[PDB]
């Protein structure tokens, strides 16, 4: 409708088409190689972090989490020492 868009319609020149429209597509992982090898390109980032035994957020989650299956004193805080934590999965062990 605009005179610029009418101008390029009347022209015999082809349009500068670009094809970048693909939703549902999730960014591929670069950076850590171990994460990339074990990443699942279909699962979401929360599902992948949980499978890899990592934490996607050190804080609370601001909604309901997905449930797929029906599951069945200042002295002793500034001075206590916590001996790390177990590695749940093999990916964390690597």
């Amino acid at each position: 409708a605009n005179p610029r868009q009418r101008n390029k319609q009347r022209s015999g020149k082809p349009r500068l088409t670009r094809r970048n429209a693909n939703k549902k597509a999730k960014a591929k992982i670069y950076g850590n190689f171990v994460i990339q090898q074990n990443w699942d390109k279909h699962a979401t980032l929360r599902q992948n972090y949980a499978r890899l035994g990592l934490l996607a957020t050190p804080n609370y989650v601001t909604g309901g989490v997905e449930k797929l299956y029906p599951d069945p004193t200042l002295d002793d805080v500034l001075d206590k020492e916590i001996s790390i934590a177990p590695a749940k999965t093999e990916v964390v062990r690597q």
């Binding site: 005179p3 610029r4 101008n7 500068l16 670009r18």
Partner: protein, 71 residues
């Protein structure tokens, strides 16, 4: 005949006595334009002409205005 051909817009709207075009404001540097004249603006805005260079700029953007020759 109080108007002649304008050196800028080429229309017969160049007042001979005032030496000022009633269409584009020639010889003022800024082209005459008014927001209440929306119809007038679209009659001479970008796109009503060739845009010979602007089309070249749009064509060259995708590859990043690259230069040189292929190997």
């Amino acid at each position: 005949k109080s108007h002649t051909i304008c050196r800028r817009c080429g229309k017969r709207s160049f007042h001979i006595q005032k030496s000022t075009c009633a269409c584009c404001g020639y010889p003022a540097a800024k082209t005459r334009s008014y927001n209440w004249g929306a119809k007038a603006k679209r009659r001479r805005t970008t796109g009503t002409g060739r845009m010979s260079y602007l089309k070249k700029v749009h064509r060259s953007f995708k590859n990043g205005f690259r230069s040189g020759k292929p190997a």
